[PDB]
Amino acid sequence: LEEKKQATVVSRPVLLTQENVPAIFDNNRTFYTKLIGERNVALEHVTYGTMIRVLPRFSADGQIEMSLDIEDGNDKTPQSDTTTSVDALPEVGRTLISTIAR
């Protein structure tokens, strides 16, 4: 065997808001499972996707300070040939960042 590979992905969310107003952009995916109990029967769910929550504010010089909460997740896939691809195992990998920049 002799293998080469290359992959590029560029994603970009855009959001518009006002001064001192919290805004949310969200692009998620929900996975519903059937927990067959008897009493507290429930539809349990997981959620993963791109998400921004920002709180912009103008400084005295004209710079923009922001309070960020960034999440970027996707679905990691195990081997499809084995039995664990038909049950409720979506191995989720996320990436969380929480900071303040100006």
Binding site: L15, L16, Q18, E19, I52, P56
Partner: protein
């Protein structure tokens, strides 16, 4: 909002605002987007000068 911030500012408040500062009632009326202040003729003018300082136009930020 603005009607909960000034209501908590004048809460309790046995203070000589120019009667007292504790008998001013502020009630939000959202059907015409306006405040309702009940007090003396000097306390009503006192809240009207505060409202015109908290009422400014905002600017838009687009985040990419």
């Amino acid at each position: 909002g603005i009607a909960t911030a000034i209501e908590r500012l004048l809460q309790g408040e046995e203070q000589p605002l120019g009667a007292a500062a504790g008998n001013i009632k502020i009630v939000a009326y959202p059907d015409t987007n306006s405040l309702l202040v009940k007090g003396t003729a000097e306390q009503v003018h006192f809240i009207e000068m505060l409202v015109k300082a908290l009422d400014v136009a905002k600017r838009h930020v687009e985040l990419s």
